[PDB]
Write a protein that binds this ligand. Structure first.
Ligand SMILES: [Mg+2]
Ligand SMILES: [Mg+2]
Ligand SMILES: [Mg+2]
Ligand SMILES: [Mg+2]
Ligand SMILES: [Mg+2]
Ligand SMILES: [Mg+2]
Ligand SMILES: [Mg+2]
Ligand SMILES: [Mg+2]
Ligand SMILES: [Mg+2]
Ligand SMILES: [Mg+2]
Ligand SMILES: [Mg+2]
Ligand SMILES: [Mg+2]
Ligand SMILES: [Mg+2]
Ligand SMILES: [Mg+2]
Ligand SMILES: [Mg+2]
Ligand SMILES: [Mg+2]
Ligand SMILES: [Mg+2]
Ligand SMILES: [Mg+2]
Ligand SMILES: [Mg+2]
Ligand SMILES: [Mg+2]
Ligand SMILES: [Mg+2]
Ligand SMILES: [Mg+2]
Ligand SMILES: [Mg+2]
Ligand SMILES: [Mg+2]
Ligand SMILES: [Mg+2]
Ligand SMILES: [Mg+2]
Ligand SMILES: [Mg+2]
Ligand SMILES: [Mg+2]
Ligand SMILES: [Mg+2]
Ligand SMILES: [Mg+2]
Ligand SMILES: [Mg+2]
Ligand SMILES: [Mg+2]
Ligand SMILES: [Mg+2]
Ligand SMILES: [Mg+2]
Ligand SMILES: [Mg+2]
Ligand SMILES: [Mg+2]
Ligand SMILES: [Mg+2]
Ligand SMILES: [Mg+2]
Ligand SMILES: [Mg+2]
Ligand SMILES: [Mg+2]
Ligand SMILES: [Mg+2]
Ligand SMILES: [Mg+2]
Ligand SMILES: [Mg+2]
Ligand SMILES: [Mg+2]
Ligand SMILES: [Mg+2]
Ligand SMILES: [Mg+2]
Ligand SMILES: [Mg+2]
Ligand SMILES: [Mg+2]
Ligand SMILES: [Mg+2]
Ligand SMILES: [Mg+2]
Ligand SMILES: [Mg+2]
Ligand SMILES: [Mg+2]
Ligand SMILES: [Mg+2]
Ligand SMILES: [Mg+2]
Ligand SMILES: [Mg+2]
Ligand SMILES: [Mg+2]
Ligand SMILES: [Mg+2]
Ligand SMILES: [Mg+2]
Ligand SMILES: [Mg+2]
Ligand SMILES: [Mg+2]
Ligand SMILES: [Mg+2]
Ligand SMILES: [Mg+2]
Ligand SMILES: [Mg+2]
Ligand SMILES: [Mg+2]
Ligand SMILES: [Mg+2]
Ligand SMILES: [Mg+2]
Ligand SMILES: [Mg+2]
Ligand SMILES: [Mg+2]
Ligand SMILES: [Mg+2]
Ligand SMILES: [Mg+2]
Ligand SMILES: [Mg+2]
Ligand SMILES: [Mg+2]
Ligand SMILES: [Mg+2]
Ligand SMILES: [Mg+2]
Ligand SMILES: [Mg+2]
Ligand SMILES: [Mg+2]
Ligand SMILES: [Mg+2]
Ligand SMILES: [Mg+2]
Ligand SMILES: [Mg+2]
Ligand SMILES: [Mg+2]
Ligand SMILES: [Mg+2]
Ligand SMILES: [Mg+2]
Ligand SMILES: [Mg+2]
Ligand SMILES: [Mg+2]
Ligand SMILES: [Mg+2]
Ligand SMILES: [Mg+2]
Ligand SMILES: [Mg+2]
Ligand SMILES: [Mg+2]
Ligand SMILES: [Mg+2]
Ligand SMILES: [Mg+2]
Ligand SMILES: [Mg+2]
Ligand SMILES: [Mg+2]
Ligand SMILES: [Mg+2]
Ligand SMILES: [Mg+2]
Ligand SMILES: [Mg+2]
Ligand SMILES: [Mg+2]
Ligand SMILES: [Mg+2]
Ligand SMILES: [Mg+2]
Ligand SMILES: [Mg+2]
Ligand SMILES: [Mg+2]
Ligand SMILES: [Mg+2]
Ligand SMILES: [Mg+2]
Ligand SMILES: [Mg+2]
Ligand SMILES: [Mg+2]
Ligand SMILES: [Mg+2]
Ligand SMILES: [Mg+2]
Ligand SMILES: [Mg+2]
Ligand SMILES: [Mg+2]
Ligand SMILES: [Mg+2]
Ligand SMILES: [Mg+2]
Ligand SMILES: [Mg+2]
Ligand SMILES: [Mg+2]
Ligand SMILES: [Mg+2]
Ligand SMILES: [Mg+2]
Ligand SMILES: [Mg+2]
Ligand SMILES: [Mg+2]
Ligand SMILES: [Mg+2]
Ligand SMILES: [Mg+2]
Ligand SMILES: [Mg+2]
Ligand SMILES: [Mg+2]
Ligand SMILES: [Mg+2]
Ligand SMILES: [Mg+2]
Ligand SMILES: [Mg+2]
Ligand SMILES: [Mg+2]
Ligand SMILES: [Mg+2]
Ligand SMILES: [Mg+2]
Ligand SMILES: [Mg+2]
Ligand SMILES: [Mg+2]
Ligand SMILES: [Mg+2]
Ligand SMILES: [Mg+2]
Ligand SMILES: [Mg+2]
Ligand SMILES: [Mg+2]
Ligand SMILES: [Mg+2]
Ligand SMILES: [Mg+2]
Ligand SMILES: [Mg+2]
Ligand SMILES: [Mg+2]
Ligand SMILES: [Mg+2]
Ligand SMILES: [Mg+2]
Ligand SMILES: [Mg+2]
Ligand SMILES: [Mg+2]
Ligand SMILES: [Mg+2]
Ligand SMILES: [Mg+2]
Ligand SMILES: [Mg+2]
Ligand SMILES: [Mg+2]
Ligand SMILES: [Mg+2]
Ligand SMILES: [Mg+2]
Ligand SMILES: [Mg+2]
Ligand SMILES: [Mg+2]
Ligand SMILES: [Mg+2]
Ligand SMILES: [Mg+2]
Ligand SMILES: [Mg+2]
Ligand SMILES: [Mg+2]
Lengths: 148, 209
RNA sequence: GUGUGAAUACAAACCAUGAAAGUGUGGCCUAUCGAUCCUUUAGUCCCUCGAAAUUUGAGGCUAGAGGUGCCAGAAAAGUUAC
RNA sequence: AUUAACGAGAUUCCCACUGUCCCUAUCUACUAUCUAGCGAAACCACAGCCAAGGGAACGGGCUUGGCAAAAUCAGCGGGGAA
RNA sequence: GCGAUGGCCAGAAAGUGGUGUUGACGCAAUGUGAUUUCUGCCCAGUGCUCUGAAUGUCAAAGUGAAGAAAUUCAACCAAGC
RNA sequence: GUCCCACCCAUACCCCGCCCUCAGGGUAGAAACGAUGCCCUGAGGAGUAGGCGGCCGUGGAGGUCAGUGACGAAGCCUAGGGCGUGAGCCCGGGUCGAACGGCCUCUAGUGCAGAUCUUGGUGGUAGUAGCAAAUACUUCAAUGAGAACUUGAAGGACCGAAGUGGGGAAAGGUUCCAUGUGAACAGCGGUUGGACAUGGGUUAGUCGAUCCUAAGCCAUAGGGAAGUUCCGUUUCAAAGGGGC
RNA sequence: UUAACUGAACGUGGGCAUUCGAAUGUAUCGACACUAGUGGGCCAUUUUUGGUAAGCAGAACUGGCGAUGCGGGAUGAACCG
RNA sequence: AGACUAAUCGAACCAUCUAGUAGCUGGUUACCGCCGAAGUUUCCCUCAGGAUAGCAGUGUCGACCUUCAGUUUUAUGAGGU
RNA sequence: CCGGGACCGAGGACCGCGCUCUGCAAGGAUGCUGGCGUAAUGGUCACCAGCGACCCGUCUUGAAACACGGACCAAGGAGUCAAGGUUUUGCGCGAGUGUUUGGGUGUAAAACCCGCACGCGUAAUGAAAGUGAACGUAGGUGAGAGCUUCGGCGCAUCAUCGACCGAUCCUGAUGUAUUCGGAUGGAUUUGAGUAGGAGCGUUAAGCCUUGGACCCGAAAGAUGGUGAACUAUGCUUGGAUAGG
RNA sequence: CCUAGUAACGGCGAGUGAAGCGGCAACAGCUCAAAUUUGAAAGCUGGCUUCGGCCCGCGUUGUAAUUUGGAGAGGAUGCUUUGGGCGAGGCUCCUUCUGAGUUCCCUGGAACGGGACGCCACAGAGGGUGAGAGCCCCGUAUAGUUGGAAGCCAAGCCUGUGUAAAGCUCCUUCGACGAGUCGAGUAGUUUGGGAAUGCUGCUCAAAAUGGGAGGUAAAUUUCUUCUAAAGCUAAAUACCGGCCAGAGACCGAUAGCGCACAAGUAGAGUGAUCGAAAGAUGAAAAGCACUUUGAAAAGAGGGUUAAAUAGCACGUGAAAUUGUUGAAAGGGAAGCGCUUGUGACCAGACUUGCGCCCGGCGGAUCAUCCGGUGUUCUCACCGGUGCACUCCGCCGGGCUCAGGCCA
């Protein structure tokens, strides 16, 4: 919508808000990233510290599928089971049955452990598991088993 | 010419991009054309389904390894197990792929069952009405409700494994002796040292002799 | 209140000197000097070559040197009276 | 370094000759000039009398004075920083 | 400067052209500028030109040695300088 | 030079009225209110470059005024009126002839004095500069609305055979001849014209082209070039015509 | 850290307002976000450098013109109100 | 003679690439209300130009925090005109 | 304590502070009287008079300038559009969020409906192999709006001392494929991290970049074509120039 | 669509930049060289022919059948499979036909406008007709209907048959597979391709479980995956240049293409090429008969028309500039600001309103009560009852209050 913009309010005022002494010429200072090392250095060092240089070794023909392993913390583990069944376990009505969670079927490969876990035994099947996550699931009565 | 705290721009607009711009104002017009072509094709194939039968296939990468999908055609070994001639398969709606192999036995068994029940559901009209043959339908059950999609009626039943399972307590297994985390570290370092360990053992045998 | 040069006070090691308290992180104080890319040497015994091993070769990580004197650092000779 | 002949080439002097000059005067033809018919262009912020002052340090316009009477024809080259 | 298997010159190339229906009293490239009388000294510098015993410098290919190989190191070495 | 009385006037200071901006308060057992409203109190106002807010106009789109109009819509002219601080809005009179507005949202090729700006039109200068090379015209009669530059006769002059004479090549293309004619053109006039309108006119065995070759150009045999095409003219070719 | 519960920093508990310990003002408190124009300057009192001097060149504190009319200096960007 | 090559020559004319680039000249369209500048610091083949800090506007949030100040008074330090 | 003159009249039931207290000069003007009821008061336009008043736009420390553009009038005429960022405003859903590449359907380029994948977000840190976030009621101390049983509990945010994950530098337990493994405890080090999630889609404005980029403007450079009717040089074939 | 502005390239400066996997649209597969028909070149161009065939030629330096790596060949073994001809009925193209007022009155030159009364509608899209028309006319909506031509698709029937040819299950053994090519060195170009991704020139020049690829050069030892140097083939995709059609929050004669018109035309240049200006009388020409002045162009009368203030210089007809008539000013510029005066012209406002008292005229109906209905449930309307000191309208007389302008 052009009916309300600052160009309509500039009618009748010479120079259209760009100044008299500085007249808004074509391209003062250069085009694009010109002057990175010569006259735009002061801007390119106060912000963007690190534009120039080489760091690290290079990799030819990287395939990102080799590096796919999404992770999930341990405090969100109970959120995988459906709500109706979930409330039964926390309320304490089963007392004799344990759930078996399959992380791969939900799209996870590594089980990290960050929060706390209630004292109910579970079984977790993961491709990878952290050292701290294995201890917390074990002290709750459960066990974690690798599945590949 | 940067002036403030900005993100460094990279806009690939220095060629003559204006000469190659592809606007899509014919999105609804093209859709009408395809629907006219589908129903025209379905009319030509009056009692036949529009599509063709496909097998079940697993994706080839470690990511996507879990899911399954439809393939291109049945291997020559799958057709032989179900007792279907190679030449007769393409002419009754079955798709054949001659450059695929059955490395495992799970995939071979799954596809054979998926192809065997299709043969039971097939109605085969005779070439000439006045003289039927042994393999033809005997005209008594030619009148029945039929399907035409064959992609929804024969799609993948479930692509992923069930989300979870529920088992009684005292049936939970015991883990690896060392533990799950340490079982991975040991298995990783064993492959790293497979070469160093092998030559040291071998040269010892020659050193003593 | 960015960089380079130079400077002050401690901490953790190893030493010199003196009977000892102490003093010493270059010249009694104020000047005496140098980025990115590339090359080269020192260091650990370390990481990668992406189908798997073993030795050559190559690439990385940390600290110095080769230089820009127009010294916050392009590679550069004249003439026009047509 | 000299050199006969030749030159719409540069330079100095002498004889003849003359309005170049002392020093200007007169005559003829075609215009300019007046009339009938035909009939353009450059240029133009608005415009058109001066003296001093101050001012972007040389005014047609501002300040203080001089002054100042319709409408017009033929000439002229001081000014309009024409 | 040149005796034709050649000198000067044109063309992207060609079983292609110009001088040339020509052959040194000829063709081609430069400086001075009728006749008369004359035209001195300098080869250090910058060019041009001549003679290869000299080994100094020295490319690709080829030859020799080391290595499991990629590769590295040695002699030899046209013209020009 | 020094001292003392009275008086004169700035958009400054004091008091009062009105406008806008900013700040602080009051208003529901609602007899209540464009609550974005109304009522009470105090202080302030200069401004280029620049920032933000509120409003007015133009061409189109959705909704709505059960809107105006051949008993006159839009447009244009008008030292005739009313409203707003202002851009602007509204009415009266004259001319004219078929479509056009108000209000809330949507949309953009949306507002001019300048750019030696673009296209078209018109002025002052101005009835002014000027229409002056090639020696030159005059009397009577006829035609006609009208005669210096149309026609006849008679005088006076010029070009003076390297001509203002008599015929051609290049180039032009009907300008050649007859009859007739309002405007336009012939930088004055015009009955006259190389102008305008209607008709007519160019005859070859002997004059030229046609035939032959010159400098030169282009096919063929062959060789180059990715190719449009370049070289080659007797060249490393099985190349022709005469009689019965 | 000291011969040393001797010190050193940070603390629990308790005591001290009857008056929170100079004047005046508070017509303007603290923090954050995004961005415009500008980066040729010039004049005056006091201090002051080069120059014979300049309506010349170069600086320090503050006030002005630029960006600003109004009343006085007849006139006059900067002087007085 | 830098002469001539269609009024064009110290490199002809016609179309296209082409709306060739410009730190440099010129222009940039209605009204009212409120706030209101800079020619200075550091770096750049930088000095007719840019980036950086300052001066400026708008949008707000934290409290109405009793905090603050281009100022005086009292006590106590530094300086070399 | 008594005279003389000028300018002004805001507000619109009662309420208040008071006094000289059957009332009043006390929170803002009323009373009496005359002429005329139309061009009389008032308004528009033209002219004379007193005072004031240099030509606009633009660059500039300084313009009325002897600085530049402009003779006059009418119509045209200059910050736009797309992709990608960023902060702020409105709206939907919220540990999630986004239907429209595509399919179903239709009164047919509209509207309505469906889901597998995928993008951004939910976890960081190293060049890399790799590893991967709770001692405590998710901590202690000083300020904090609001609430409160009056004792206290204390959101957002600011300062300060600690704890946990990755990297870097030390220490090297039990064990053992006797060279592998890396527990535990430290360090004036380091990160765009953890410490009771805040993001995703869309709307509107300012600003930034590349694109013709607010509009008009060079002296040049390149690709492919047309000219010897002028003039320059040469070739084949013709012509012309008194008398002393 | 996503991967992805990612791995990588780059005076590592300005800048540049793919692929595998994943979801969808659309789906379809095949024949040659290398074998001896060898118990029979079984194959083909051409010419003639009565239509049955004959003749010459091509070809053994290889024409048909058989085989193409998925295999296949050669053997075993029992079952199965295969030709011709009709054909309802349905779908595309052109062509015949399709509902309802010119009813009545007013304005007007002419109703298609205003008012009254009707009708049609699976048809109220659009245009014409003397001004805005669903019913005056062409068309528009719906399935049918008249007639005709040629190809497709296909329900289901009627008939031959194993000399031949084809498919499946097993096996000791056999199992031919593309050369100046692949690969290597060197040079130039190019790419995200980095001790060299593709391409081309020159030198060298292979092999049989061989050969290529596996994104860092080299040697030794394993592993995975395909089969190069010969060939064919629909759909999903691009495009408004050619022939047609339907549309728009597009422009409205200096705009929109250079061209709404006898526009790539007139005109300019030796040539390549450059390239405009220009739409509108009225519903209908009814485009001015006749008279008179003039040499003529034309004028003055008189006519056509709703209008000639529409006369082929034609709808509306603005500004710059000009003519006539009327008003005013002027001693080397004019214009303009503040404030009076003179002359000309002009908008408002005022011209009565309310209340009380007396008299007169005219009407039905004020308080009250009963029945019915509504509603905010206690306030009203309608019907009846009143019947003159009440209520309502008008006229005449008297009085109070207020109302325009300047003082
Ligand atoms: Mg402004
Ligand atoms: Mg400007
Ligand atoms: Mg600027
Ligand atoms: Mg530099
Ligand atoms: Mg510092
Ligand atoms: Mg420093
Ligand atoms: Mg020490
Ligand atoms: Mg010393
Ligand atoms: Mg260095
Ligand atoms: Mg470098
Ligand atoms: Mg490896
Ligand atoms: Mg590899
Ligand atoms: Mg270097
Ligand atoms: Mg420097
Ligand atoms: Mg550079
Ligand atoms: Mg001499
Ligand atoms: Mg001589
Ligand atoms: Mg004269
Ligand atoms: Mg005259
Ligand atoms: Mg003067
Ligand atoms: Mg002077
Ligand atoms: Mg003067
Ligand atoms: Mg002047
Ligand atoms: Mg005067
Ligand atoms: Mg003069
Ligand atoms: Mg002038
Ligand atoms: Mg020769
Ligand atoms: Mg010489
Ligand atoms: Mg000479
Ligand atoms: Mg000579
Ligand atoms: Mg001589
Ligand atoms: Mg000599
Ligand atoms: Mg010499
Ligand atoms: Mg010599
Ligand atoms: Mg060599
Ligand atoms: Mg040599
Ligand atoms: Mg005042
Ligand atoms: Mg005031
Ligand atoms: Mg428009
Ligand atoms: Mg009208
Ligand atoms: Mg009309
Ligand atoms: Mg515009
Ligand atoms: Mg204009
Ligand atoms: Mg302007
Ligand atoms: Mg013009
Ligand atoms: Mg003119
Ligand atoms: Mg004259
Ligand atoms: Mg003449
Ligand atoms: Mg003359
Ligand atoms: Mg004359
Ligand atoms: Mg003459
Ligand atoms: Mg006549
Ligand atoms: Mg006569
Ligand atoms: Mg004459
Ligand atoms: Mg003569
Ligand atoms: Mg004569
Ligand atoms: Mg002669
Ligand atoms: Mg003649
Ligand atoms: Mg005649
Ligand atoms: Mg004439
Ligand atoms: Mg005439
Ligand atoms: Mg005539
Ligand atoms: Mg004639
Ligand atoms: Mg003619
Ligand atoms: Mg004869
Ligand atoms: Mg002849
Ligand atoms: Mg002939
Ligand atoms: Mg001949
Ligand atoms: Mg030729
Ligand atoms: Mg050839
Ligand atoms: Mg600067
Ligand atoms: Mg700046
Ligand atoms: Mg200056
Ligand atoms: Mg500047
Ligand atoms: Mg001055
Ligand atoms: Mg100075
Ligand atoms: Mg100066
Ligand atoms: Mg001032
Ligand atoms: Mg003054
Ligand atoms: Mg004075
Ligand atoms: Mg010269
Ligand atoms: Mg020419
Ligand atoms: Mg010329
Ligand atoms: Mg040239
Ligand atoms: Mg050109
Ligand atoms: Mg432009
Ligand atoms: Mg240009
Ligand atoms: Mg203001
Ligand atoms: Mg202010
Ligand atoms: Mg300038
Ligand atoms: Mg601020
Ligand atoms: Mg001193
Ligand atoms: Mg000192
Ligand atoms: Mg008041
Ligand atoms: Mg009056
Ligand atoms: Mg004056
Ligand atoms: Mg100047
Ligand atoms: Mg300025
Ligand atoms: Mg000015
Ligand atoms: Mg001047
Ligand atoms: Mg200037
Ligand atoms: Mg200038
Ligand atoms: Mg001018
Ligand atoms: Mg103008
Ligand atoms: Mg004028
Ligand atoms: Mg305009
Ligand atoms: Mg955007
Ligand atoms: Mg998601
Ligand atoms: Mg990682
Ligand atoms: Mg509190
Ligand atoms: Mg832009
Ligand atoms: Mg050019
Ligand atoms: Mg160049
Ligand atoms: Mg010629
Ligand atoms: Mg010649
Ligand atoms: Mg002679
Ligand atoms: Mg490259
Ligand atoms: Mg590229
Ligand atoms: Mg895919
Ligand atoms: Mg035949
Ligand atoms: Mg077969
Ligand atoms: Mg049929
Ligand atoms: Mg009909
Ligand atoms: Mg009538
Ligand atoms: Mg009607
Ligand atoms: Mg009509
Ligand atoms: Mg109609
Ligand atoms: Mg009708
Ligand atoms: Mg092959
Ligand atoms: Mg090759
Ligand atoms: Mg190339
Ligand atoms: Mg290459
Ligand atoms: Mg093909
Ligand atoms: Mg129009
Ligand atoms: Mg046009
Ligand atoms: Mg026109
Ligand atoms: Mg227009
Ligand atoms: Mg045009
Ligand atoms: Mg022509
Ligand atoms: Mg017209
Ligand atoms: Mg007439
Ligand atoms: Mg007559
Ligand atoms: Mg009319
Ligand atoms: Mg008439
Ligand atoms: Mg008309
Ligand atoms: Mg006219
Ligand atoms: Mg007209
Ligand atoms: Mg006029
Ligand atoms: Mg005079
Ligand atoms: Mg004046
Ligand atoms: Mg007056
Ligand atoms: Mg009643």
């Amino acid at each position: 919508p052009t009916r309300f913009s600052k160009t309509r309010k500039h009618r009748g005022h010479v120079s259209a808000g760009k100044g008299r002494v500085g007249k808004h010429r074509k391209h003062p200072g250069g085009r694009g990233m010109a002057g990175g090392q010569h006259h735009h250095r002061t801007n390119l060092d106060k912000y963007h510290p690190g534009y120039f240089g080489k760091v690290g070794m290079r990799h030819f023909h990287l395939l990102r599928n080799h590096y796919w392993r999404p992770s999930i913390n341990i405090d969100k583990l109970w959120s995988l089971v459906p709500s109706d069944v979930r409330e039964q376990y926390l309320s304490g009505q089963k007392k004799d049955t344990a759930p078996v969670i399959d992380l791969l079927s939900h799209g996870y490969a590594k089980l990290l452990g960050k929060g706390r876990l209630p004292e109910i035994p579970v079984v977790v099947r993961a491709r990878y598991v952290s050292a701290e996550a294995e201890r917390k699931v074990k002290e709750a009565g459960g066990v974690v088993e690798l599945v590949a | 010419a940067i002036k403030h705290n900005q993100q460094i721009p990279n806009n690939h607009f220095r060629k003559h991009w204006q000469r190659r711009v592809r606007c899509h104002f014919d999105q609804p017009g093209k859709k009408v054309t395809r629907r006219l072509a589908r129903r025209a094709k379905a009319a030509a194939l009056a009692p036949r389904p529009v599509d063709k039968l496909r097998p079940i296939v697993r994706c080839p990468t470690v990511k996507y390894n879990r899911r399954t999908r439809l393939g291109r055609g049945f291997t020559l070994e799958e057709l032989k197990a179900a007792g279907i001639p190679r030449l007769l398969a393409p002419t009754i709606g079955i798709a054949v792929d001659h450059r695929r192999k059955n490395l495992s036995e799970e995939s071979l068994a799954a596809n054979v069952q998926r192809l065997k029940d299709y043969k039971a559901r097939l109605i085969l009209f005779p070439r000439k009405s006045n003289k039927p043959k042994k393999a033809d339908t005997p005209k008594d059950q030619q009148t029945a409700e039929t399907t035409t999609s064959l992609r929804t009626s024969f799609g993948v039943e479930q692509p992923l494994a069930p989300g979870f399972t529920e088992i009684s307590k005292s049936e939970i297994p015991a883990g690896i002796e060392g533990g799950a985390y340490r079982a991975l570290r040991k298995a990783r370092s064993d492959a790293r040292l497979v070469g160093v360990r092998e030559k040291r053992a071998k040269e010892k045998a020659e050193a003593e002799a």
